[PDB]
Write a protein that binds this ligand. Structure first.
Ligand SMILES: O=c1ccn([C@@H]2O[C@H](COP(=O)(O)OP(=O)(O)OP(=O)(O)O)[C@@H](O)[C@H]2O)c(=O)[nH]1
Ligand SMILES: C[S@@+](CC[C@H](N)C(=O)[O-])C[C@H]1O[C@@H](n2cnc3c(N)ncnc32)[C@H](O)[C@@H]1O
Ligand code: SF4
Length: 279
């Protein structure tokens, strides 16, 4: 297997408290920028073309994030560099310094009601979201949305906002139940209350049939179709077995085979696309 698109969850720490979080703040480890430049360079030669900087909240570590996305673009010559943010801590001066090297910026908002955001776990607003879009236009970054369809917001009509906001990519996740993260009271979270049925999700997706960018991801396709990197730089298996050893201590090949990655769901959910800043 060739790791084309990789999600580097370099930290688990965050300033929000979404009830359904499936990458909880179980540890506060973050890698040295020396070791992270090992893994990303090791992963580039292995076949990586898109990197996604996610985790807990990546803008809690703006210096690390800034050093890596510059390294990933300028010296690694990577096809596409992405970031996924909740939007609270994003600031324009960051996009001044590094926006030349950001190819896709993904702001995730689950509702446009401040009341719904409160119930889900975002205290507050949406003016920030429109602001980041304005910044993305100025600094030539591709702007995408990530909303999670859950019990609170599965009835909403988000069309009017998405025509003006107009993202090139709009992911709608059916709430996922990662075992170990948000499947019991023992864990940091418990998302079973926010679960919605297959038809509840389809009503949401069918309601936004006017949206061309809409890319749905039910639990069929989201569960085991991602290449996830720990803060310790090890691939996470979402099939049942424990995580691999670090790519820093063993290398990419041994780490990838220690994890199940369904390349068919990867292609079905639209994992390969026009991810570059051109074309
Ligand atoms: O079990 C899982 C599954 C998924 N995830 C995480 O959910 C996040 C969803 O975030 P995205 O869907 O935006 O990842 P992406 O940038 O790679 O997608 P494309 O650009 O290719 O369209 C991903 O970063 C993934 O790692 C988990 O944390 N755990
Ligand atoms: C874990 S977040 C990491 C980046 C950043 N913390 C953020 O909120 O965007 C990655 C994406 O997964 C989504 N997500 C979080 N919990 C989820 C869940 N339980 N089911 C499906 N998607 C979820 C979020 O909306 C976010 O867009
Ligand atoms: S969904 Fe994102 S912002 Fe919310 S708790 Fe999880 S990592 Fe933090």
């Amino acid at each position: 297997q060739v790791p084309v698109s990789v999600n580097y969850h370099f930290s688990r720490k965050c300033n929000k408290e979404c009830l359904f979080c499936f990458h909880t703040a179980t540890t506060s480890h973050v890698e040295k920028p020396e070791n992270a430049k090992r893994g990303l360079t090791l992963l580039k030669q292995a076949g990586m073309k898109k990197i996604n900087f996610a985790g807990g909240e990546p803008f809690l570590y703006p210096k690390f994030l800034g050093e890596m996305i510059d390294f990933c673009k300028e010296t690694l010559q990577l096809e596409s560099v992405s970031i996924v943010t909740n939007g609270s801590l994003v600031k324009e001066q960051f996009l001044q310094k590094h926006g030349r090297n950001i190819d896709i910026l993904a702001v995730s908002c689950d509702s446009f009601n401040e009341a719904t955001n409160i119930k889900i776990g975002r205290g507050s607003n949406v003016q920030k979201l429109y602001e980041i879009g304005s910044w993305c236009q100025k600094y030539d970054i591709k702007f995408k949305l990530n909303t999670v369809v859950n019990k609170f917001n599965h009835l909403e009509d988000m069309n009017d906002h998405l025509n003006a906001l107009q993202p090139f990519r709009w992911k709608c996740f059916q709430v996922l139940i990662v075992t170990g993260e948000n499947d019991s009271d023992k864990t940091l979270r418990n998302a079973h209350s926010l679960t919605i049925s297959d038809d509840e999700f389809d009503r949401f997706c069918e309601r936004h049939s006017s949206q061309t960018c809409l890319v749905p991801e039910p639990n069929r396709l989201m569960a085991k179709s991602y290449l996830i990197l720990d803060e310790y730089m090890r691939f996470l298996d979402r099939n049942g077995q424990q995580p691999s050893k670090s790519i820093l201590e063993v290398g990419v090949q041994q780490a990838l085979q220690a994890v199940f990655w369904d390349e068919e769901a990867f292609v079905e959910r639209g994992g390969i696309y026009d991810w570059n800043k051109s074309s």
